[PDB]
């Protein structure tokens, strides 16, 4: 009988494999691995996972020392109970893994730990240091609206703006008299990307990554969608487009960068 536990190791993947060669990866309904799980692969052939797609939440696909469990998503209505129930389907054993569903609007770190605890398996979790987080911190600043607008027209960068923030729209309409307010891209000398709080933060970031244009923005979702600074930071990790991020005050810069680079 295995002793259930969650050991956060600092050792390399190859040394961690000396205790156990078994890897627990997480995939969506179509058999697509989540980023964190893909970082534990070292050239293994993952064709076996695509073959039987689509899958049911809770399905377990095995091949060699790799075990893939299909987990639910909050985007589709998943809950911690549903997440925990899916991991219990994984055969009790010793596995090297990562915390599941840690993306934007995904499961929180504690919800992920909760699911692994209810599982009677022994897990060796490796750190998932944020991609390009060391580069995103250099774009963190604390500028007022006037400074952000000036930088955007002086540099021709796209500036995402939440239409639900009346004070911001009033400033933009007084400076750029006659500017056509409309949801989406608006471009006349200065270019903006207007969005509402009814549009999911994960959707707004997906559209910005699609445009892939240099940005000047505020933490997307912060205050607007009810997100606090830590929650908006978790979503901004997904922003791949180059961007200058402005926080409400300079003391929030060190705090924000902190959330942007944690494991
Ligand atoms: Cl993801
Ligand atoms: Cl199965
Ligand atoms: Cl085997
Ligand atoms: Cl948490
Ligand atoms: Cl990085
Ligand atoms: Cl470092
Ligand atoms: Cl558009
Ligand atoms: Cl669109
Ligand atoms: Cl706050």
Swiss-Prot record:
Its cofactor is Zn(2+). It is a multi-pass membrane protein. It is found in: Host membrane; Host cytoplasm. The hydrophobic region HD1 probably mediates the membrane association of the replication complex. Changing residue 179 to V: In strain: Isolate Shanghai QXC1. This is Papain-like protease nsp3. Responsible for the cleavages located at the N-terminus of the replicase polyprotein. In addition, PL-PRO possesses a deubiquitinating/deISGylating activity and processes both 'Lys-48'- and 'Lys-63'-linked polyubiquitin chains from cellular substrates. Plays a role in host membrane rearrangement that leads to creation of cytoplasmic double-membrane vesicles (DMV) necessary for viral replication. Nsp3, nsp4 and nsp6 together are sufficient to form DMV. The chain holds residues 1207 to 1469 of 4382 of the full protein. It comes from Severe acute respiratory syndrome coronavirus. It catalyses: Thiol-dependent hydrolysis of ester, thioester, amide, peptide and isopeptide bonds formed by the C-terminal Gly of ubiquitin (a 76-residue protein attached to proteins as an intracellular targeting signal). It comes from the Viruses.
């Amino acid at each position: 009988k295995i002793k259930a536990c969650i050991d956060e190791v600092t050792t390399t993947l190859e040394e961690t494999k000396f205790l156990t060669n078994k890897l627990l990866l997480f995939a969506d309904i179509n058999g697509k691995l989540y980023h964190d799980s893909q970082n534990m692969l070292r050239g293994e052939d993952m064709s076996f996972l695509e073959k039987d797609a689509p899958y049911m939440v809770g399905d377990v696909i095995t091949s060699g020392d790799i075990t893939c469990v299909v987990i639910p998503s909050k985007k589709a209505g998943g809950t911690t109970e549903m997440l925990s129930r899916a991991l219990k389907k994984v055969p009790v054993d010793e596995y090297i893994t990562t915390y599941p569903g840690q993306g934007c609007a995904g499961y929180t770190l504690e919800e992920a730990k909760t699911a692994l605890k209810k599982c009677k398996s022994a897990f060796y979790v490796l750190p998932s240091e944020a991609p390009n987080a060391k580069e995103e911190i250099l774009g963190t600043v604390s500028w007022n609206l006037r400074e952000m607008l000036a930088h955007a027209e002086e540099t021709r960068k796209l500036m995402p703006i939440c239409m639900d923030v009346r004070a911001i729209m009033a400033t933009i309409q007084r400076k750029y008299k006659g500017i056509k307010i409309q949801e989406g891209i608006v471009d006349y000398g200065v270019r903006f990307f207007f969005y509402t709080s009814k549009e999911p933060v994960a959707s707004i970031i997906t559209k910005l990554n699609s445009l892939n244009e240099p940005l000047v923005t505020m933490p997307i979702g912060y205050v607007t969608h009810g997100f606090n600074l830590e929650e908006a930071a978790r979503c901004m990790r997904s922003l791949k487009a180059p961007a200058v991020v402005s926080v409400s005050s300079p003391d929030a810069v060190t705090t924000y960068n902190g959330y942007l680079t944690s494991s």
